[PDB]
Design a protein that fits this description.
Chain A contains 13 helices and 16 strands. With about 400 residues, chain A is of the alpha/beta class. The interface between A and B is medium-sized, with 32 and 31 residues. The structure holds adenosine-5'-phosphosulfate (2 copies), beta-D-glucopyranose (2 copies) and potassium ion (2 copies). Chain A: Keywords: ATP-binding, Disease variant, Dwarfism, Kinase, Multifunctional enzyme, Nucleotide-binding, Nucleotidyltransferase, Transferase.
């Protein structure tokens, strides 16, 4: 299957930069720039750039782009612009996008359309609650959206010591080919890997071997774009994942660790389709989904913002995902008798303790060990080190 | 095909008997209008009130998926109080009752959470509780129940308008009787002015010029729940009758019928439902204009929806392959022509826009609208209506 990168070809790049120095310019945020990276590398194939109004409408109402054939696309990738910049750029079909003093892309054949923020947040998140940190960022953005074709001058790098893990979809396909994979199964995650997560990955590996695949390769794919203020930062999460692999909870020989560049929306069953389709583009034939994917507590009511079973049900159902098989799972929890993470069975409610992020964070803050079997000790050590660094 | 949910007349006595002995759930008038919608096949291929899986398909994809892709963009669900859910959750089957009467049996029932904020957000693109239908959803029970619906008999209202409440199959039969070779539908909730008439007349003209010999207009006023300040159904039926009597629309090539669905006022989401239901009734052409199924935002008083979105969305919506969308832009009063005409931007100063507000003013003042805006006998029906409000 095809991957549509948006980079300027290597020969024409001197010419294109020269052109870019002469164009009107538009400042974009760090969030916008992460979306530029997403688009540039082909994760949103077949988009040619930021969404035009027609593509936006298709995504909002149908969770699929339609024009080149039905392919899943459930979140808008759009560029908000202030009314002042919109007026400034009237009649300008092409202009450069800039961040941090650097020109990063040319946007051609621009189309401005009204940023209807309430409707956008309602349809994407199922709420307009301003305490939701990503919704908060949408509401504070400009009153216009600009769609158009994007020519990205070069790969977006962040010079944080992690660029070597920011593999493109083409690079992930090539790496899987070099490992002689006959099945690629992806695990999206935003959190540290505990042994419930590992249980999902090892059970998926087991089932792929039983089907007759000989070299299934795990794509352990932590998300690395914007995340909310309280979460464990990307660099610490990468150290924690490396510790899980060093402990052998996951096998480094059959695993690729890479960073998925998308911002996190925390939009549950809407977002999990984007997490899946982007991995599909990168060549994953199988996609793991568990309970409450891409969810968070409602900031007002503190209840689950989404029904925790909806992500898997929707994803197993979703159109435009024909080259990836969904592997859904139910809740993993701590089995007290086995001293191991296990699949929860209501029929045996008394045998399990559910994993509370709040309680686990309290343990890590105080340096207390979790129950035996919850997380590999060197990875837990990464987390207690992290919380000590904040004092 | 059409999937009606009625008990076969040969098995009715058995089923009625069973219904007499089952636990019972009292439903609202709005619920009963949804029972009518379901029972007659407007939401084919649904077997009843939506189960959670169908609800999720509709909210996220605007299509039902299991028997092939077919457009379905609004939930048709039955809300249930926490108390009634606790009372019935140990029951696989029970009766739906309204006004002391047993109207249906719900079989293989499944209760799931009514997550109201998410439902209203995804269907309407807002949770504004001043929106009157959203208000009704917010005040309903905390559970939804889905299941297979067995409807004992046709839902009749016995108000003197049941003769217009045709089922999809009855609409196909009438079109057969009229020897139609094309059926084009006009959904509406408002009185017919000559802009609406222009959309229908222009559609007829274009079908004639494409070689259709007997195009039949389905003038299909919605007749389920509507908001308080709309013109009531009975007045609208008299107003439409007067439009046909004046010849503005031709009665010999027109079917006037009442579409039983409640009105959501959910704009581009709802217009797909207005379209797919007419597709089920055999319309192969569907007219859509500006701001279909829209309303002013109750809070900000702007348009709740972008007025071009309904036609743009409908024109590319999936699961509508057996109906051709015919979109139109704004029709407004051309002063120089003294007639309704398609609006022209370069030409802006020649167009007069006559809102319901200015019609209220015109009737209050004992005045008529400019010549050409509405057929005189139909405007007269409206002045009777406004007068009846004292
Ligand atoms: N205890 C659990 N049991 C089952 N699945 C889980 C559990 N915790 C997390 N998951 C799943 O594990 C994957 C990653 O979870 P997170 O990193 O927390 O968040 S997510 O945003 O990436 O989804 C998702 O598929 C999610 O549903
Ligand atoms: N002035 C107008 N010009 C063009 N289309 C119109 C106009 N007014 C209404 N419409 C369209 O006429 C049809 C019926 O409109 P209404 O009865 O007002 O409301 S609706 O809810 O049924 O859509 C819809 O297709 C709507 O878009
Ligand atoms: O997920 C990548 C990064 O996004 C940032 O906005 C968050 O503040 C960090 O905690 C996180 O590492
Ligand atoms: O549309 C049918 C009826 O619905 C009711 O809710 C409204 O109050 C009536 O005015 C309307 O005629
Ligand atoms: K602005
Ligand atoms: K309740």
């Amino acid at each position: 299957s095809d991957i549509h990168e948006l980079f300027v070809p290597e020969n024409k790049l001197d010419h294109v930069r020269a052109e870019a120095e002469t164009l009107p310019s538009l400042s974009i945020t760090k969030l916008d720039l992460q979306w530029v990276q997403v688009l540039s590398e082909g994760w949103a194939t077949p988009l040619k750039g930021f969404m035009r109004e027609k593509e936006y409408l298709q995504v909002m109402h149908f969770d699929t782009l339609l024009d080149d054939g039905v392919i899943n696309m459930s979140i808008p990738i759009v560029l908000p612009v202030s009314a002042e910049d919109k007026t400034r750029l009237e009649g300008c079909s092409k202009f450069v996008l800039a961040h941090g003093g650097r020109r990063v892309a040319i946007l051609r054949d621009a189309e401005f359309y009204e940023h209807r923020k309430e409707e956008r947040c309602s349809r994407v998140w199922g709420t307009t609650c301003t305490k939701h940190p990503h919704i908060k960022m949408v509401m504070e953005s400009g009153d216009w959206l600009v769609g158009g074709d994007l020519q990205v001058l070069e790969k977006i790098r962040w010079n944080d010591g992690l660029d070597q893990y920011r593999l493109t979809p083409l690079e992930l396909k090539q790496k899987c080919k070099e490992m002689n994979a006959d099945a690629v199964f992806a695990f999206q995650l935003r959190n540290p890997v505990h042994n419930g997560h590992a249980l999902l990955m090892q059970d998926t590996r087991r089932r792929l071997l039983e089907r007759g695949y000989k070299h299934p390769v795990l794509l352990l794919h932590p998300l690395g774009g914007w995340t909310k203020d309280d979460d464990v930062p990307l660099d610490w999460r990468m150290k924690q994942h490396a510790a899980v692999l060093e402990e052998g909870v996951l096998d480094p020989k059959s695993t690729i660790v890479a960073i998925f560049p998308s911002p996190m929306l925390y939009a549950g069953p809407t977002e999990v389709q984007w997490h899946c389709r982007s991995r599909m583009i990168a060549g994953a034939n199988f996609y793991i989904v568990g309970r409450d994917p891409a969810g968070m507590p409602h900031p007002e009511t503190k209840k689950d913002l989404y029904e925790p079973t909806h992500g898997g049900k929707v994803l197993s159902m979703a159109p435009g995902l024909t080259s990836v098989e969904i592997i859904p799972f139910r809740v993993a929890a701590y089995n007290k008798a086995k001293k191991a993470m296990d699949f929860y069975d209501p029929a045996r409610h008394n045998e399990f303790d559910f994993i509370s992020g709040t309680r686990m964070r309290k343990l890590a803050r105080e340096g207390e060990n979790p129950p035996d079997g919850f997380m590999a000790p060197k990875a837990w050590k990464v987390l207690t080190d992290y919380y000590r660094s904040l004092e």
